[PDB]
């Protein structure tokens, strides 16, 4: 009986794989990018990438290939999962609709098979006879491609060679032919085999087995005109074919390992090469013609081109554009030029995509002391290292603050016929109108001509022809720029109020009830035109001249009042088109139209807070996409703001919302604001690219942030951060960091670039003398980062080969100072394990960093929590609980030695602890008896842990080696010595990601319980919450129903995906829920949605509301 719920807060951002070709059309260059369980499809263009289709899979993509067999119009996608789900994919556009379809699929794992050295490799033959896979040592699976094989049936074949490194099929071949470097005793070697599938053997390859280097790691297969194979090692490259052996040993690649590659020219005179350093090489093949004979080769060379992010993945695109898929760092788009710049880099970045990198540690700190957590992560590694501050919501910066309990609208106002700037803001009020002439940035309220002060103003537009408009209850008024007086004045024939105003800078439409007029502000006067009456009361109207008409506005839309409805119409005619008959007894408070790039739009707010949304047509006039959001609880006033190129839609609600643009779609992110009643663009000399915004009581003005549900700030560290601490009293962060340096010719270590440790504002080294008795060393530092500017205030450098492994920020004992404590370790290649290290207690003062105290230890301090004014610390399979003397020193109290190697710890308010490397978890208590630990219980499964957390007194969360989560609680049962000294694995789940860090906090706010966030190697940020048994049940049910309705993509069973799995155990998930899957609900059509209920009660739209209240947990 364990009840937990997991959702994604940030989708993985690392790029594991990427591939190029014609998948969308046969004319079309596509970029395919694999995240983890996410597949991105782009179309390449002049600007770069046009986005097209982002889908998710129920597995971690491990192999991704594009290929084409005979009589096939365009390319097909091959995908293999880490749990051996295989599938073939076809890109299908039903005119306006997009589907990735599953042409074939099956699961290719074997019951036998020890998963190999160098993981899964999948390859495809140049002709497309087949697919070759290498999932296991000794074995080599083969899936023949045919019209059938719709379940991808495969035979295996025996491989003499047990330690294969890399494999591809050779171009220009009679029979199917693989080619591989394998390792045995005497070194590494290269080998070939035809594959005859008729008899499923191997047969014999066309070229003897030659040697290749000790570090041979990549096999490149050179396309037809050339044929053959390129092998890459450390410091060397080589080429093989027939009796042809060409080799180069360019000192320049010796520096670091090559690691990815990519064919540039289809013939393959040229290839791209990626280093672990970030360096980008070009590999060139000098061809050679002999008259009536096929092309040969003469020579090959290597040219350093520049520097990218650390490349996992490389793909030449159009014309000198190179996509650079990174996972240690941000992915990027790059230009290659014939001409170097200054520094001599042929590479120029064009675009940069943010990867939350490997998130290595993190924490939550309401920077701006708000109630919303911001999250701060250690990201990246080496030169890509960084901090990333992560903030939900679109925020704004408040310039003035005028307490005005009333404000019932507000439009712009330029006190001049030329400047874009408006030095006045007329604001409809509680039955009145006040005016605000500005001395620029100064607030001042005066009078104005033909604009009433004892009459509410329903409008203020910006009508051309040098005139200012004031629609009021009574009469659509007029004032001039030349005259500036009572230029004109419309009035309703019988003396009846305008109910609902609307217009632009050229058009006017009012309404009296169902009554519809139409007038125009023609040179210095208001001339009338059409008329019509309506079924019921007119609730709201919108007019604005769209794409193909300046000022004079085409068709229209309106909301009625009894039938609760909205409908489409025209201009002087008023002819009724298609419509929608929305439900309820609450009317549509708003309903305006707009566009952006390539679509016209209609949206309609109601008064219950909810909203219905639709796209339109300037010509025709048709329906669109019926769905129903929620935003506020209160009425919602739609508007439109000056941003960048795509000036957008703002929602005025008790929960202020912006509507931006997605793929070509529309965003729906929170605005980090109290509450907003009305709002408009603005621009005064005192308040430029502004946005006015009024609430319950008070005017305000400011700019806007990016958009994405989340903002991610930046902080390039240039080395790799490792741990992170917020010490609030000192308003800074402690961050452990590490830089690489190289031996000298003084032997001593130098550096490779300016880091944050070396560009620090000030600095220490460790002086302390506790110990006695080319090449690459790490140098470790404690950084002190300003929470406001994110500057390295101070840097302390540690001893030669001291690695700083743990960090805290606490007060100890009676002592009222707050310290920074760093647990360390001495480290050497020779040694298995360290056997000495120290704990150092530190204080940051005004601008100083004082080594307050040291303490030697006899191993690695892997972790340390602060306990109860005491300091508790894991030290090489030996837990210790220190105490702070009054004399200011760390002195032992007790130990626990029952650990293989204690990696993680956490503390439950009381006297409880937990942790371990290859066991699972233990719990302990402290006993204010003899100040000892009593070992309360453990878990006897072989979990290679990676992170650990206490959800609460009894629920312990754990992540591990194999991308699985699990939960433990102590048995509540009789015979309380054996059954008590065990705790059962009550929760199981396969995440699909690897968790470096848990921790308490949330990104939201000022049903569920708690909130634990995690960060993963991949960029993904998840969140774990707790449930009521009832809520669990509803959701488990609804999970199972939801799976019937949704078609996965390889056809993959969702439940097969989610199943606890190790290379030695496989159980289905219990006590865990993906909101990820739950949330899917909403993007399902009401029909398919209907089904999910056949059946305290049974409903249909309750559940929609229930998923809603959830999507807002993050």
């Amino acid at each position: 009986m364990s009840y937990n719920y997991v959702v994604t807060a940030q989708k993985p951002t690392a790029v594991n794989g990427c591939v190029t070709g014609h998948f969308t059309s046969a004319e079309d260059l596509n970029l395919l990018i694999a995240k983890n369980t996410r597949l991105e499809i782009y179309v390449v263009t002049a600007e770069g990438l046009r986005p097209v289709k982002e889908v998710g899979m129920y597995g971690k993509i491990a192999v991704m290939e594009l290929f084409r067999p005979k009589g096939e119009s365009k390319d097909l996608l091959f995908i293999l999962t880490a749990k051996y789900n295989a599938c073939i994919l076809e890109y299908k556009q039903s005119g306006e609709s997009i589907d990735i379809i599953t042409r074939a699929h099956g699961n290719v794992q074997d019951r036998i098979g020890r998963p190999s050295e160098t993981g899964i490799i999948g390859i495809i033959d140049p002709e497309c006879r087949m697919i070759g896979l290498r999932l296991y040592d000794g074995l080599f699976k083969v899936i023949p491609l045919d019209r059938d094989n719709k379940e991808l049936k495969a035979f295996n074949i025996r491989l003499e060679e047990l330690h294969v490194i890399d494999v591809k099929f050779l171009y220009g071949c009679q029979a199917p032919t693989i080619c591989f470097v394998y390792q045995d005793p005497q070194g590494r070697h290269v080998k070939t085999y035809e594959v005859s599938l008729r008899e499923k053997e191997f047969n014999k390859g066309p070229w003897k087995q030659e040697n290749v280097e000790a570090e041979a790691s990549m096999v490149i297969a050179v396309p037809e005109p050339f044929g053959g194979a390129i092998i890459i090692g450390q410091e060397s490259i080589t080429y093989h074919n027939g009796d042809k052996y060409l080799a180069i040993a360019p000192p320049i690649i010796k520096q670091s390992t090559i690691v990815c590659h990519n064919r540039v020219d289809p013939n393959g005179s040229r290839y791209l090469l990626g280093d672990m350093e970030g360096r980008l090489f070009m590999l060139l093949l000098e061809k050679e013609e002999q008259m009536d004979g096929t092309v040969t080769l003469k020579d090959l060379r290597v040219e350093l081109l520049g520097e990218t992010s650390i490349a996992e993945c490389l793909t030449y695109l159009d014309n000198g554009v190179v996509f650079v898929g990174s996972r240690l760092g941000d992915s990027q788009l790059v230009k290659l030029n014939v001409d170097s710049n200054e520094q001599g880099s042929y590479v120029v970045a064009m675009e940069t995509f943010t990867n939350l990198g490997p998130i290595v540690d993190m924490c939550v700190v309401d920077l701006e002391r708000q109630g919303q957590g911001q999250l701060v992560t250690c990201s990246g590694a080496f030169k890509e290292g960084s901090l990333r501050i992560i903030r939900n919501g679109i925020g704004i910066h408040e310039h003035a603050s005028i307490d005005l309990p009333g404000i019932k609208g507000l439009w712009p106002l330029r006190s001049d016929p030329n400047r874009e700037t408006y030095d006045t803001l007329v604001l409809s009020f509680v039955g009145q109108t006040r005016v605000l002439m500005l001395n620029g940035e100064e607030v001042e309220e005066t009078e104005l001509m033909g604009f009433v002060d004892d009459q509410q103003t329903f409008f203020c537009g910006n009508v051309a022809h040098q005139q200012l408009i004031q629609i009021t209850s009574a009469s659509v008024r007029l004032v001039s720029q030349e005259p500036k007086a009572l230029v004109s004045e419309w009035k309703e024939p019988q003396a009846k109020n305008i109910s609902v105003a609307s217009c632009n800078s050229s058009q006017v439409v009012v309404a009296v009830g169902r009554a519809l007029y139409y007038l125009q502000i023609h040179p210095q006067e208001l001339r009338q035109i059409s008329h019509t009456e309506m079924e019921h009361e007119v609730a709201c109207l919108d007019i604005t001249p769209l794409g193909d008409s300046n000022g004079l506005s085409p068709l229209c839309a309106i909301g009625l009042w009894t039938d609760i409805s909205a409908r489409i119409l025209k201009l002087p005619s008023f002819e009724l088109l298609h419509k929608e008959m929305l439900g309820g007894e609450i009317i549509p408070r708003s309903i305006l139209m707009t566009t952006f790039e390539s679509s016209h739009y209609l949206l309609c707010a109601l008064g219950d807070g909810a909203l219905f949304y639709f796209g339109l047509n300037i010509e025709t006039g048709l329906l669109s996409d019926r769905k129903k959001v929620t935003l506020g609880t209160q009425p919602t006033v739609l508007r439109t703001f000056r941003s960048l190129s795509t000036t957008n839609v703002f929602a005025c609600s008790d929960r202020p919302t912006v509507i931006y643009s997605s793929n070509h779609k529309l965003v729906f992110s929170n605005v980090n604001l109290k509450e907003v009643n009305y709002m408009c663009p603005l621009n005064s000399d005192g308040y430029p690219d502004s946005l006015a915004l009024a609430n319950n009581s008070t005017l305000t003005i400011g700019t806007i942030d990016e958009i994405q549900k989340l903002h991610i700030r930046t902080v390039p560290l240039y080395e790799s951060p490792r741990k992170i601490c917020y010490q609030e009293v000192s308003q800074c962060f402690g961050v452990l960091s590490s830089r690489i340096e190289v031996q000298d010719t003084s032997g001593g270590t130098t550096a490779l670039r300016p880091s944050a440790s070396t560009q620090a504002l000030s600095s220490s080294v460790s002086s302390s003398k506790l110990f006695s008795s080319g090449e690459e060393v790490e140098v470790h530092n404690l950084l002190i980062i300003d929470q406001h500017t994110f500057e390295v205030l101070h840097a302390h450098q540690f001893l030669q080969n001291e690695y700083a492994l743990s960090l805290v920020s606490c007060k100890l004992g009676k002592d009222p100072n707050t310290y920074f404590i760093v647990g360390t370790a001495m480290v050497y290649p020779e040694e298995a394990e360290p056997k000495q290290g120290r704990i150092v207690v530190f204080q940051y003062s005004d601008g100083k960093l004082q080594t307050v105290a040291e303490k030697e230890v006899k191993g690695a301090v892997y972790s340390m929590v602060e306990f109860n004014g005491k300091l508790l610390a894991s030290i090489n399979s030996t837990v210790r609980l220190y105490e702070w003397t009054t004399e200011k020193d760390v002195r032992t109290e007790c130990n626990h030695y029952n650990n293989i190697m204690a990696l993680y710890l956490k503390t439950k308010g009381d006297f409880i602890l937990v942790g371990d490397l290859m066991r699972s978890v233990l719990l302990l208590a402290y006993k204010p008896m003899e100040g000892n630990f009593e070992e309360i219980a453990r878990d006897f499964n072989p979990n290679w842990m990676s992170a650990v957390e206490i959800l609460d007194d009894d629920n312990f969360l754990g992540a591990e080696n194999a991308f699985n989560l699990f939960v433990c609680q102590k048995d509540s049962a009789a015979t309380t010595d054996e059954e008590r000294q065990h705790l059962q694995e009550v929760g199981l789940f396969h995440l699909g990601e690897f968790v470096n860090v848990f921790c308490h906090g949330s990104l939201v706010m000022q049903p569920t319980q708690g909130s634990v966030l995690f960060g993963t190697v991949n960029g993904m940020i998840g969140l774990v919450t707790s449930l009521s048994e009832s809520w669990y049940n509803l959701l488990l049910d609804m999970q199972n129903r939801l799976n019937k309705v949704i078609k996965s993509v390889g056809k993959i069973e969702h439940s097969f995906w989610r199943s606890f799995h190790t290379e030695r155990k496989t159980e289905p998930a219990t006590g865990f829920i993906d909101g990820d899957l739950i949330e899917s609900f909403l993007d399902i059509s009401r029909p398919k949605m209907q089904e999910v209920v056949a059946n305290r009660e049974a409903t249909a739209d309750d559940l929609i509301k229930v998923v809603e209240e959830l999507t807002r947990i993050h």
Partner: peptide, 13 residues
């Protein structure tokens, strides 16, 4: 050192 080891399983494969 399993420490090389942690950092590595830590930054991924």
């Amino acid at each position: 050192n399993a420490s090389s080891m942690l950092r590595k399983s830590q930054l991924g494969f």
